[PDB]
Design a protein around this ligand. Structure first.
Ligand SMILES: Oc1ccc(/C=C/c2cc(O)cc(O)c2)cc1
Lengths: 115, 114, 115, 114
């Protein structure tokens, strides 16, 4: 489990459940190719997106479908989605936890990188 | 205007208007004595809280009544209020802008010292 | 484990380890009396602060000694500390996770409340 | 000034100066076409990116080159950049202020629509 995504709801004070997450990897031609996807669980977490073998060095984009999340709650959000673009494993395999705290007109994201 | 407070609403995407703000200064006996207070304007800002002469070195506490703000919007907030406690150093010309971004169960605050 | 504190470092992308945390409860005379204290572990978490029996309704203040944390890293922080003041269990026992993301001149805190 | 960008530094407690900002608009073919660009000023702000006439309804992407900002400070950041993607509705008079608070491994962004 080298890549983990945690999504929290700042309005309800709870995990953001069933949020669609799409992960892409930048290909040689500067194109974003689908890498993995899933939905957050009851704990607002998404595990098992990839393996150490498949998660090679590269530029990755974690796209969180925040818009659909808020719409389902009857709130008109500002953002189309939240994106986190980062270079991974450039100096060896690391464990990445990408966390996002969501509000209708704002979001905060942080990363926790472990060995 | 050595001290300025800016409050934003992360739910409505607007300035947090009419939010009560109380500023205290720590006294010699470790007690918090009232220093200044006001309410944010239409731009979610609060100016003229103090002057350079009165704003001396010390420990200050900026208390933002976030609870009343959310209650007025029909939302039950988590926090009683948001507090920002800092030491106003006074080492060279400095203006302090305390900004706070509010959500019902969360708040973020930052300081811009220029 | 009705009260949990999680502290993260936004500068290093890691858990904030060994951060002193003091919890107070507002007494009848509007005074803050010591309730519990501890230091965050390697995971940036602090468990076992109290029990369901002892964690009664009331106003609590979680004080995070952020200043000492940054000083130890050779960084002069803005805040003396970070405080989170909230009413707990006013409508029955709840589980509270208080999270704080720290930066030298900024901090973000959120709460996750469970049944 | 229908669109304004404000960038702050959470590590130094100051405006994020000289940060490159690129704005794109989604074209009919789902492609991102350059719309405007600039660099934040001493106040960490970027004004005059567009006009009311040119800023029509559509999906816009504000890209903040955070990586270059941190590298210049001798800090290795986590993100390649920070992006803010939103639909500019155009329902009544509206000004958009996109604010971003930057940290090496974290960033927070909010929108103030007044
Ligand atoms: O502004 C904010 C941005 C991010 C966060 C993250 C919190 C968090 C808490 C956990 O227990 C586990 C985790 O992986 C992440 C909190 C506030």
């Amino acid at each position: 489990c080298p890549l983990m995504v945690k999504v929290l709801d700042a309005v309800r004070g709870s995990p953001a459940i069933n949020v669609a997450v799409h992960v892409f990897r930048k290909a040689a031609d500067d194109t974003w190719e689908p890498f993995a996807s899933g939905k957050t669980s009851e704990s607002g977490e998404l595990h098992g997106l990839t393996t150490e073998e498949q998660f090679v060095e590269g530029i990755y984009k974690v796209e969180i479908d925040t818009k659909s999340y808020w719409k389902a709650l009857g709130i008109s959000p500002f953002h189309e989605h939240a994106e986190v673009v980062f270079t991974a494993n450039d100096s060896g395999p690391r464990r990445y936890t990408i966390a996002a705290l969501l509000s209708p007109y704002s979001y905060s994201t942080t990363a926790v990188v472990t060995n």
